Design a binder for this molecule. Structure first.
Ligand SMILES: O=C(O)c1ccnc(C(=O)O)c1
Ligand SMILES: O=C(O)c1ccnc(C(=O)O)c1
Ligand code: NI
Ligand code: NI
Ligand SMILES: [Zn+2]
Ligand SMILES: [Zn+2]
Lengths: 330, 330
C-alpha cells in the first residue's frame, strides 16, 4: 500500500499534467496522497491564476466575522460575531493595523508557537464564505470556477439528475483568523488556492483515523457532544497540536504559501490559521471514490450546522433513511 | 436602421455559427433583433442539450408556488402561496390531473383566448427559480451553465473586480402558470431554453417603448404605484394583449416550443404563460452594450422585490448614488 504512514505529499505537475484535473487527482491517489487527508500541489512555472491582484480592493465583505474564543489556550471554541460591511481595501488596512498585524517572528515554527500561546486572548476578524472567484476566465487549467459539478458527478455515477449548483468561495484572512476542526459537507473533497498574501498553516488527521479525533472531541467538549451527535459539523472547536500529541491522535501539519493549491480528501479532518492578510479561494468537488463516503457521512440534525441549497439532494438520494430527521434540523 | 418596426426576429444558426455565443448575440443585434426586446433562436439540427429527459423525475421542487389572481380577466395581480415540497414526477402527475390539465383546443390562438378569458378563475402551481441545470456537461455550444459571467463582463469593461456568482435556474410549469410583466434585474439580458413539454407564449414591449408600458401600469394599478416607484419589479402585474391594444401600447407576441431558445434584451418588458407541463432553464447575462442600461436601471427600494446576492455589487458600482437607499430596502 502506498503512503502507509499517511504523510502529506507534495506534487509538482508539469504543464502537460496540469491539463486534466480529474486525471491528476486520480494520479495523486494512486500514489497514496489521500491517506494523509491533505495534499499540496505546486502549479507549473508557466501557470498563473490571473494577471495581477491590483484591482481587488472594491470587493465587498458584506458580513465580516469577529472570532471570539472561550476555553483554554489549547482547547477552545470560537463564536462568530457579525460586524458591519467593509471593502477588501478597508479590511486589508485593518489587518495591517497595530491591533491586528502579525507580530515579529523568526520563522513559521516561531509564529505557530505564538499562535497557540496567544490566540484566545484576541478576536481577529475574518472575511469568510464570500461567493465569487478571482480566477481569470481565460485560465483554463485548475480554474476553481470551471470544475465539473458535484451534481453532474452524482448523475454520472448513480444515474439520477438532481437540482443544485456548486460555485467557489473567497476567504479574506488576517493574523490569527482560524478555521476549526471539520470535514467537508457530506465528506466531500475540497480544493483551496491561496491567491495572495501571507501563509496559511494546516493541521490534518488521516481519514482512516478520523474517529479517534471525534472521540477526543467528545471528551474535551462534553456539553457540546451531549447537544449534538455530530457537533464538529458546527465548525467551532479547536484542539492544539500539543493536546493532540498528548492524546496520541495521529495528525500532520504543513504551511501553504501564496500560489499553492491544497486538496482535502473525503473525511480528512482539518483545522488551521492565517499568518497575516491573505486571500484564498475554495470549492468542494467529488470523484467516483467519494460516493461511498457521502453515503456514510455523519449529519448534524440539531439545527446549528449551516447548510447550502445543494445539500438537500445529497442527503435525499444518498441517505434516504436520515433525510426526514435531517430536514427537520434544517 | 435595422428592424425599425421592432418585430420579433427568428434565427437559424448553422453548427459553425453556434460555436461562439457572444459573437452570435452581436450578430443578431447587427440585424436589429434587440429592437423587439425578444428573439427566438432555433439550434442547428446537429445540436442537442442532453441525451434524454428520462431521468429527471427525482428533482425536488422545494417550494412550489400557487399563483392566486385578483382583479379582472385582462388586468390582474397574482400572489404566490407556498405549497409543500414535491418531486418533478409528482408535479408532472399533478399538472396532468383533471383539475390542472390543458383543455381541448384547436391551435395556439384558441388556447391564448382561453387563457385570457379564464386565467383568473384558477390557481395553477408553478415550480420556479430552482437553482440547477439540465444541460449535459459535454454540450459545448449554448450551454447555459457555461456562459461568461456578468461579474467577469463588468470587470472586463470597467476594470473592477467584484464578488458574486451567476448560475442557471429551472422552471417547471403547467397550464395557466404565468410570468408577470417585468424586465430583468438591473435590466440584464436573459436567455431561456425550453427543455421539454408543452409550449410557452411570450409577450414583449420594445425597449424603446418601455416607458409607455410603465405609464399604463401606473394607471391600472394605482395603489401599487403609490407604494413603490418601480412596482413592476415585484413581478406580480398582468395586462392582457387586448388591454395593451386598447391603450395603444406597442408589443409583440410569439410562442416558444420545446428545443428552442429565447433571448430577452436589456429593458425589454415581457410576460407570458405555459400551455401545459414543461421545463425551461434560464440565466441572466451581459454584453458591453448592457452597461449603459445597468447604469440607468430603475430600482425597487420598498423592500418587496426579491434580490440575489449578486445584485449588491451591480448597484454599488454602477449606481453609487442609489446604493444606500436601495440597501435599506434589502
Ligand atoms: O478558512 C479557510 O481557509 C478554510 C480552510 C479549510 N476549510 C475551510 C472550510 O470552510 O471548509 C475554510
Ligand atoms: O417563468 C418563465 O418561463 C420566465 C420567463 C421569463 N422571465 C422569467 C423571469 O423570472 O425573468 C421567467
Ligand atoms: Ni474545509
Ligand atoms: Ni424574465
Ligand atoms: Zn448539531
Ligand atoms: Zn417595491
Amino acid at each position: 500500500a502506498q503512503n502507509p504512514n499517511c504523510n502529506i505529499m507534495i506534487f509538482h505537475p508539469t504543464k502537460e499534467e496540469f491539463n486534466d484535473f480529474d486525471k491528476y487527482i486520480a494520479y495523486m491517489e494512486s500514489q497514496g496522497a489521500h491517506r494523509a487527508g491533505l495534499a499540496k500541489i505546486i502549479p507549473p512555472k508557466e501557470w498563473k491564476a490571473r494577471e495581477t491582484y491590483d484591482n481587488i480592493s472594491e470587493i465587498l465583505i458584506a458580513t465580516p466575522l469577529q472570532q471570539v474564543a472561550s476555553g483554554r489556550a489549547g482547547v477552545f471554541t470560537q463564536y462568530h460575531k457579525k460586524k458591519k460591511a467593509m471593502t477588501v481595501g478597508e479590511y486589508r488596512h485593518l489587518a495591517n493595523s497595530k491591533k491586528y498585524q502579525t507580530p515579529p517572528h523568526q520563522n513559521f515554527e516561531d509564529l505557530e508557537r505564538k499562535y497557540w500561546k496567544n490566540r484566545i486572548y484576541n478576536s481577529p476578524i475574518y472575511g469568510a464564505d464570500i461567493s465569487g472567484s478571482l480566477f481569470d476566465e481565460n485560465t483554463k487549467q485548475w480554474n476553481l470556477g470551471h470544475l465539473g459539478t458535484i451534481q453532474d458527478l452524482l448523475e454520472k455515477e448513480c444515474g439520477v439528475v438532481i437540482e443544485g449548483v456548486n460555485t467557489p468561495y473567497l476567504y479574506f484572512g488576517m493574523w490569527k483568523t482560524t478555521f476549526a476542526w471539520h470535514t467537508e459537507d457530506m465528506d466531500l473533497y475540497s480544493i483551496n488556492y491561496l491567491h495572495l498574501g501571507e501563509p496559511k498553516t494546516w493541521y490534518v488527521v488521516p481519514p482512516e483515523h478520523g474517529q479517534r479525533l471525534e472521540r477526543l472531541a467528545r471528551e474535551l467538549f462534553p456539553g457540546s457532544s451531549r447537544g449534538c451527535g455530530a457537533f464538529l459539523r458546527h465548525k467551532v472547536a479547536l484542539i492544539s497540536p500539543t493536546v493532540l500529541k498528548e492524546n496520541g491522535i495521529p495528525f500532520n501539519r504543513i504551511t501553504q504559501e501564496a500560489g499553492e493549491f491544497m486538496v482535502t480528501f473525503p473525511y480528512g479532518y482539518h483545522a488551521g490559521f492565517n499568518h497575516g492578510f491573505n486571500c484564498a479561494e475554495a470549492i468542494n468537488f467529488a470523484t467516483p471514490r467519494w460516493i461511498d463516503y457521502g453515503k456514510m457521512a455523519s449529519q448534524c440534525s440539531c439545527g446549528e450546522a449551516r447548510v447550502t441549497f445543494s445539500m438537500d439532494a445529497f442527503v435525499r438520494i444518498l441517505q434516504p433513511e436520515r433525510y426526514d430527521l435531517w430536514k427537520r434540523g434544517q
